[PDB]
């Protein structure tokens, strides 16, 4: 689809066989998602954002559905305010800025 | 335009008389500017994402070009890693999100 900005740019997402709810995040080099039991291998890794860097729990190569789209690659479990899926899956998506 | 995402969308801005290099941050509801010394009045304000909270400057009715795109709006001036054009801003250059 095209979507604006005047809100959010939230989607449903499904990762590990449940729906959530995450912001599709160009500002975002990496997918982070809330704290969560999931499917997959994992390794401790650092990240940073405006505010600072937290502790996270990276794991590859995992499906994920956004807005009915699939990818398959990292996705960061932590701290995170918000489900944000950044550029990694972004551009398994197809997913351009345009004006 | 159409700006893909294999890496950081930075594209040039104008600000307070000043060329500058931004992320276009569909993730970002405003848009936070390294310190600068902007002209007038502001508001302390807080914001804050993965790591917490930063303390910025609220400068309101700020002029700003975007790639070339003439815009006008708040901009939060502070401590960012990285300069970031959030929506308040990419919706008035007619930015979307396009799969
Ligand atoms: C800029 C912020 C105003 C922006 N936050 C928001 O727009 C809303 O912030 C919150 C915070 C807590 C609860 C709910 C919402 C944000 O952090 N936006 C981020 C995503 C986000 C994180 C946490 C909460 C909400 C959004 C990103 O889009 C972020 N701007 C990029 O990663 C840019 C970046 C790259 C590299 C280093 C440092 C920063």
Excluded: C
């Excluded at 982070?32 to 729990?57: A, C, D, H, N, Y």
């Excluded at 190569?61 to 995170?80: M, R, Y």
């Excluded at 899926?85 to 997913?95: P, S």
């Amino acid at each position: 689809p095209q979507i604006t900005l005047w809100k959010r740019p939230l989607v449903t997402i499904k990762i590990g066989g449940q729906l959530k709810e995450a912001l599709l995040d160009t500002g975002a080099d990496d997918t982070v998602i809330e704290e969560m039991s999931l499917p997959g291998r994992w390794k401790p890794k650092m990240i940073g954002g405006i505010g600072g860097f937290i502790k996270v729990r990276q794991y590859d190569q995992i499906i994920i559905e956004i807005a009915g789209h699939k990818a398959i690659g990292t996705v960061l479990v932590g701290p995170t305010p918000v489900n944000i899926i950044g550029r990694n899956l972004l551009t398994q998506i197809g997913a351009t800025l345009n004006f």
